[PDB]
Amino acid sequence: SMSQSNRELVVDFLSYKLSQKGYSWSQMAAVKQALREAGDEFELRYRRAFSDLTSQLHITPGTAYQSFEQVVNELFRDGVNWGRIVAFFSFGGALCVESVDKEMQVLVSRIAAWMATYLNDHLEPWIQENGGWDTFVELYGN
Amino acid sequence: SQSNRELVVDFLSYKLSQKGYSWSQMAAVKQALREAGDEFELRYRRAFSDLTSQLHITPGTAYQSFEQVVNELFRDGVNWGRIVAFFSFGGALCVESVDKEMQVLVSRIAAWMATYLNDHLEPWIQENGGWDTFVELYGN
Ligand SMILES: Cc1ccc(CN(C(=O)N[C@@H](CSCc2ccccc2)C(=O)O)C(=O)c2ccc3c(c2)CCN(Cc2ccccc2-c2ccc(Cl)cc2)C3)cc1
Ligand SMILES: Cc1ccc(CN(C(=O)N[C@@H](CSCc2ccccc2)C(=O)O)C(=O)c2ccc3c(c2)CCN(Cc2ccccc2-c2ccc(Cl)cc2)C3)cc1
């Protein structure tokens, strides 16, 4: 328990320090780091679209899924691409922050579950057809 | 998939941390330690380079170098600042191993760090309120 959590902290810290030098702890660590960076990049470049989105958000536990679904359906209306997948993660992140800001922290675990289901059902088939997350890492790094 | 749930959790942990929030207690510790490591490495830019002048890392001498540095680091006792330096040292030794084309040493360094943490740091950590105390102190 303390043993597993100590190994987890070590792995997390070393994954981070290796990534800062262009190295990686594992394939999964390389995906996680490249997605974190892509999220930061997307949010900064589309800071206006991010600001317009958060301003229009009126989060309540009863309308949270509705808001999630409407944005995600609009986002992927014309199909899937890596850029839109990054925007999907950025949107989930913004909805979680907005939930915590509005003292609705209970929504965070729900949003993560909705994201994971949407990924499994609607994004994973396209991801697998397009070479998987390794292709994303390769394309983003280039 | 398990890996898709893991990516979601990782991304959300990061975005919540950027606003001073956290996904979980464990995510808050990981993020506070990553930041403290970055801060220590910026404040002491030449600390590892001053050590490398004598640490010629090889699979045969890596453990002896790790053990000596870590024993010298904690000679006067444990504190949070030295624990951060311990993680930064491990990180630097892993980078140096990959630079010297001996990435096979990375998983051994990780195992040595985890054993030192379990055996020699965890009693002081637990006596000092656990990793929550570190998060509280670093955030202040
Ligand atoms: C890191 C990064 C990611 C994405 C881009 C932009 N981008 C492209 O550069 N695309 C490429 C094709 S992918 C190439 C690629 C990219 C990354 C890695 C690997 C390969 C192209 O065009 O050549 C897009 O695709 C792209 C994707 C989504 C959106 C835009 C553009 C424009 C703004 N729009 C707002 C929006 C509309 C509807 C519904 C919701 C939201 C919305 C989502 C979240 C919030 Cl928080 C707020 C609002 C979302 C730029 C940088
Ligand atoms: C985020 C942060 C952490 C630590 C500090 C610095 N620092 C202090 O400021 N400490 C405090 C008391 S703890 C306060 C605290 C800190 C963080 C969180 C919470 C509370 C003080 O004194 O006021 C120290 O403790 C401290 C600890 C270790 C060392 C130093 C200073 C100076 C350099 N020295 C080199 C060295 C010597 C022997 C063996 C190995 C190495 C060596 C380790 C790793 C490599 Cl990579 C290379 C070489 C190691 C500064 C910022």
Q: Per the CB < 8 Å rule, is A93 touching B33? A: no
Chain A contact probe: residue of B9, B11, B30 with most A CBs at under 10 A: B11
| A73 Cβ below 6 A of ligand 1 | no
Instruction: Tokens for B19, please give them.
Output: 């606003």
Q: In Å, how far is B20's CA from the nearest CA of chain A?
A: 10
Check if B100 contacts A (Cβ < 8 Å).
no
Longest CA–CA separation in chain B, Å: 47
Name the burial class of residue B137, with classes exposed (0-12), middle (13-18) and buried (19+) by CB atoms within 10 angstroms of its CB: middle
Instruction: Tokens for A3, please give them.
Output: 């043993």
Separation between Cα atoms, residue B118 and residue B111, nearest integer Å: 10
With b for 16 or more beta-carbon neighbours within 10 A and e for fewer, the A47-65 pattern comes to: eeebeebeeebebeeeebe
Separation between Cα atoms, residue A128 and residue B3, nearest integer Å: 13
CA within 13 Å, CB half, A3: 3
Ligand nearest to the CA of A134: 1
- A129 Cβ partners below 8 Å, 6+ apart? none
- A133 Cβ partners below 8 Å, 6+ apart? A31, A127, B3, B7
Q: Given the structure tokens 């989105």, which residue do they identify? A: A53
Q: Per the CB < 8 Å rule, is B7 touching A120? A: no
- B80 Cβ partners below 8 Å, 6+ apart? B128, B134, B137, B138
Instruction: Tokens for A111, please give them.
Output: 């949003």
Comparing CA positions, the residue from B1, B5, B35, B50 lying closest to residue A12 is B35
Residues with CB under 6 A from ligand 2: B 36, 39-40, 43-44, 47-48, 51, 69, 72-73, 79-82, 84-85, 88-89, 92, 137-138
User: Is B19:A100 a contact under the CB 8 Å cutoff?
Assistant: yes
Q: Per the CB < 8 Å rule, is A112 touching B14? A: no
User: Is B89:B70 a contact under the CB 8 Å cutoff?
Assistant: yes
Instruction: Tokens for B11, please give them.
Output: 């991304």
Instruction: Tokens for B17, please give them.
Output: 């941390």
Separation between Cα atoms, residue B32 and residue B134, nearest integer Å: 8
CA distances from B113 to A38, B46, B77, B91, B119 (A): 31, 22, 17, 10, 10
Given CA atoms B93, B16, B24, A121 in this order, what sign does their dihedral have? negative
Q: Given the structure tokens 């993680």, which residue do they identify? A: B87
Cα A128 to chain centroid distance, Å, stands at 18
Separation between Cα atoms, residue B100 and residue B59, nearest integer Å: 11
Resolution (A): 1.9
Q: Per the CB < 8 Å rule, is B8 touching A119? A: yes
User: Is A98:A90 a contact under the CB 8 Å cutoff?
Assistant: no
DSSP B23: S
User: Is B91:B129 a contact under the CB 8 Å cutoff?
Assistant: no
CA of A86 to the centre of ligand 1 (A): 7
Helices (H), chain B: 2-17, 25-43, 47-52, 62-73, 80-99, 104-116, 122-127, 131-139
CA distances from A19 to A37, B34, B61 (A): 11, 12, 25
Cα A39 to chain centroid distance, Å, stands at 7
Check if A104 contacts B (Cβ < 8 Å).
no
Domain ranges of chain B: 1-140
User: Is B90:B82 a contact under the CB 8 Å cutoff?
Assistant: no
Separation between Cα atoms, residue A46 and residue A42, nearest integer Å: 6
No. of helices (H) and no. of strands (E), chain A: 8, 0
Chain B: residue whose CA lies nearest to A94 = B15
Separation between Cα atoms, residue B55 and residue B62, nearest integer Å: 8
Instruction: Tokens for B23, please give them.
Output: 């996904």
Contacts of B11 in chain A (CB under 8 A): 32, 35-36, 39, 89, 92-93
